[PDB]
């Protein structure tokens, strides 16, 4: 048990030999955020160990209302979930590795470390992986907009895990000076949010945000305060008229009741998909995670100046436009948008809390005209609506992130767009069908790095190559002295100092840097 045992400040833990890698799982990095610690900042884990800690159990998911659990009851996970899991390749020739820290996606509402497979990256064997668990949904992100319930608990959980990695990953054979922080979807937005902290360079050497960034409209949201009291009203806390008594009452309810009440916010299947999300915190809440619009943070230059890459895929908006092609008895769900567009588009595209009712309806009319024209909403116009979702949910925020970083930051900033449709992906799950070519949907690229149950077990020959390319891209990025970035045969071109955007196009059998006034 020489390799299975690891010395931490609290004592020793025992991991598992998996043949090609060692795993040390469910290591707590904070006190359980239960009872009086619900809706509070994470507390550093303080318990000392008298025995050998059993680090052999799969990290539990955070208690969540999981979109992709079928059935009326989508509650899964545990409230006691603040854990890191370390995966180290087995190699008789090599025991020091760079580190990829991983933040799972799931719209800040659901998802889990264990659903992001580590077999692909362990088989390639070029870095240690650390999966971070963090509070989700109302438990991670409920907010009244004041210092009694400021919010962003899940982002503070991630940051404390990042400190844990700095302090302890060398006990596992990791190089703490070579940490690359990566994440997809809400994980990618979280990575960008962590990077926006001024001291982020002390926690990581580099960062990579896949199909998620701090400027996407489902990330930093307005309207949380009323959502918080709306949650209070659904769980028997209608009598609370201020933040402090709302917090007290909410803490008197079982966590499962609070999370189940997420269902009351979902007014069309799983729509809006992020009723709880990051927010701006007030200047008088100590330890606040973010208090300024991230655009103003970037312009100030006062953020972690590390190399960063941000990416999207060409039909990214398949999450979650594809739920509109789900068939019913009466017809197809998208048919309803011919009558309900003004009601639903602000929820689907995340501008219901940032515009007046008049401006909201004008924008709904405007974007429908530009993308759909005079077509009716049906399967024939679905591709144009999916393009609208791709642009507002994912692409526009990528372009604006890249624009602000290339102008106001000195560190290299890179980007790619991926176009290579998977056989199946998240869109077949949302639409419950396989008779429509959705294109390259949210997660088609990232699933090649961390395998999951949504795509095929077997990768096509081209995908096996692309997968190794991505994994090696991340490995080299974590070890890079100069902040350069390379996919396969293509160096990424830095966007700093170029008039046009520099966007690496990755496709089935190659890649090529392209230059754009605006993203295509």
Numbering used by the authors: 4 to 523
Task: Share the article's original sentences.
By far the best characterized ODE for the model insect Drosophila melanogaster is esterase 6 (EST6). EST6 is a member of the carboxyl/cholinesterase (CCE) family of proteins, which is represented by 30–110 different gene/enzyme systems encoding diverse functions in the insect genomes so far sequenced. We also present a crystal structure for the enzyme which, together with in silico docking studies, supports the kinetic data and shows that its active site can readily accommodate short chain fatty acid esters, including the yeast and fruit volatiles above, but not long chain fatty acid esters like cVA.
After six rounds of directed evolution, the EST6 variant with greatest soluble expression (EST6-1) contained 16 mutations; K15V, V145L, R208K, G229E, N237S, T247A, D290G, I292F, I335V, E383G, S400G, A416V, F450S, F456S, N485D, I511T (note that amino acids are numbered from the first residue of the mature EST6 protein as it would be processed in its native form within the fly and omits the start methionine included to permit heterologous expression in E. coli). Four of these mutations have been found in EST6 from several Drosophila species (V145A, R208K, T247A and I292F). Importantly, the catalytic activity of EST6-1 was very similar to that of EST6-WT, suggesting that the 16 mutations principally affected folding, rather than function, consistent with their being located remote from the active site. EST6-1 adopts an α/β-hydrolase fold, including the conserved catalytic triad and oxyanion hole. The active site itself is formed from the catalytic triad (Ser188, His445 and Asp319), oxyanion hole (Gly108, Gly109 and Ala189) and additional residues (Tyr322 Tyr449, Phe450, Asn455, Phe456 and Val457) from a helix after β7 and a loop following β5. The result is a narrower and shorter active site entrance in EST6-1 in comparison to the open and accessible active site in LcαE7 and the deep gorges leading to the catalytic triads in AChE and JHE. The active site volume of EST6-1 is estimated to be 935 Å3, which is consistent with the observed preference of EST6 for smaller substrates than LcαE7.
